[PDB]
Amino acid sequence: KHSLPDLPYDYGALEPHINAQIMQLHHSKHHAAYVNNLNVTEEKYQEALAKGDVTAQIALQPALKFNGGGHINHSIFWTNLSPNGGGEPKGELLEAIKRDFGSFDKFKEKLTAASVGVQGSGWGWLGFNKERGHLQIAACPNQDPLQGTTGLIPLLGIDVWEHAYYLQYKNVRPDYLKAIWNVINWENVTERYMAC
Amino acid sequence: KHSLPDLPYDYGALEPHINAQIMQLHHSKHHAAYVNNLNVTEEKYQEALAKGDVTAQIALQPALKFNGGGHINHSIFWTNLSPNGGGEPKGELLEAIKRDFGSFDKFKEKLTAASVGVQGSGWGWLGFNKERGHLQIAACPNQDPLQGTTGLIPLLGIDVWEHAYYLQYKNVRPDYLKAIWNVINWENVTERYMAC
Ligand SMILES: [K+]
Ligand SMILES: [K+]
Ligand SMILES: [Mn+2]
Ligand SMILES: [Mn+2]
Structure with a gap:
């Protein structure tokens, strides 16, 4: 079970x-x-x-x-x-971000855009494409898991179902996304990246 | 515009x-x-x-x-x-409800079930099927409109996107659905029914 x-x-x-x-x-x-x-x-x-x-x-x-x-x-x-999250990644991960997205800020921008753009309930993901060996941004509807439906290995996920932010940010998803960058555990994202 | x-x-x-x-x-x-x-x-x-x-x-x-x-x-x-809604329908509409669903209570039960069962964001609808000339219950995902995607004529709609109830009922959709029966404008639903 x-x-x-x-x-x-x-x-x-x-x-x-x-x-x-x-x-x-x-x-x-x-x-x-x-x-x-x-x-x-x-x-x-x-x-x-x-x-x-x-x-x-x-x-x-x-x-x-x-x-x-x-x-x-x-x-x-x-x-x-x-609670000790936020800031920027360091090491191999940050290097892969620059390589695949240009810079950390362009990465933030594209992940934020993919997340805000979900119509209805869904998730914004930073995933790893094993076949091509590059980082990739994807959005999944409802509760469709990243690996099971796209093959990408999930590194960082952002829940954009309304229950994830409505009580505090109401209808303004951008505010929620802006705030969530402060508590992201890059240490965990890095481990998931290394594991593959 | x-x-x-x-x-x-x-x-x-x-x-x-x-x-x-x-x-x-x-x-x-x-x-x-x-x-x-x-x-x-x-x-x-x-x-x-x-x-x-x-x-x-x-x-x-x-x-x-x-x-x-x-x-x-x-x-x-x-x-x-x-604000003057609630209660039960009367006349031709109530007659069609009994005919197609058995009784008003069975209707409430099936519409409530279809609404609570939407996975993610969506709508629960009581629609009219012009071809068969009978009432029909349907659920649509996200913002997909009833007539445009199914051909049914919308009579009564129930929004089950989380923003429609979360602030007040949190995660308990059943409570929201139980409460919304008290403010349903059967007069309007009846007009929409007569129009077709
Ligand atoms: K488990
Ligand atoms: K209009
Ligand atoms: Mn969630
Ligand atoms: Mn709505």
């Missing part, structure tokens, strides 16, 4: 950039629902697979991608943030 | 079911952005069409469906609500 990971920090550790109420709801309510629904759905899938029921397997795909994706995305997201 | 319609009531007229802050933001910020972006996009489309630029026409489709859909959906939504 899958389980809700514990936050590596306190709910209010990202203040004033992301207030405690959002973190608490996001983690204990939203993420929890996905994990629970993921376990229920995998349960039904194992049953459909055992009986070789193809129709059931196919009918179950949206639920599995949605809840499975939700679990994967949020688990990575929590580790992407840190 | 298209323009932001005025609300037929005060921002706080739907209290306590939908508070004034949501109505104000929803109407003056969210809806306004769609109308503005719709006019800009139609402007570019007329230009692409004049020069017979097919590539430009196709590249512009997401923006036009998203902002155009947003304008259409919200314009109908405002008229679907009323």
Whole structure:
């Protein structure tokens, strides 16, 4: 079974950039629902697979991608943030950013643009393309996970579902994105980059 | 050009079911952005069409469906609500509800279910199918308008984008849906039904 990971920090550790109420709801309510629904759905899938029921397997795909994706995305997201985050990357990672995007600022600009431009609910991602060996920016709708649907290895994710910022920034996504740069855990992003 | 319609009531007229802050933001910020972006996009489309630029026409489709859909959906939504709303329909409409769904309560149940079940942002609709001459429940993702994408004539719409309820009901959509039944303008839904 899958389980809700514990936050590596306190709910209010990202203040004033992301207030405690959002973190608490996001983690204990939203993420929890996905994990629970993921376990229920995998349960039904194992049953459909055992009986070789193809129709059931196919009918179950949206639920599995949605809840499975939700679990994967949020688990990575929590580790992407840190009260000691912010600033800029250093070393091999920063070098790859300059190489693939021109400069750190152009990178920020393109990731911010891809994130603000999502129509409806979704995610903005900085991913690694193993085939080409270069960094790449992508946006995924709803809870569609990056690796599972595009093949890219996720390094940094930005949740742009309205529940991720509405209580604090209302309809102004740009403000939310501007603020989230201050708590990004580049140390974690770097580890994910090195791992591949 | 298209323009932001005025609300037929005060921002706080739907209290306590939908508070004034949501109505104000929803109407003056969210809806306004769609109308503005719709006019800009139609402007570019007329230009692409004049020069017979097919590539430009196709590249512009997401923006036009998203902002155009947003304008259409919200314009109908405002008229679907009323401080004097709630209760049950009467006459031909109520008769068609019983005929097509069994009873008013089964209708409420199915519309509520379709609305709560939207994954990500979307809408729950009670529509009229002209070909078959029966009522039908449908759910549309993001801002995809009902008639334009399914052919059904929209009668009653329920916005389930998180911005429509988060400030007041947080993550609990069921509470939001339970509350919205109290301010539904059945008089307007009936007119839309008669019109076709
Ligand atoms: K797990
Ligand atoms: K108009
Ligand atoms: Mn989220
Ligand atoms: Mn809306």
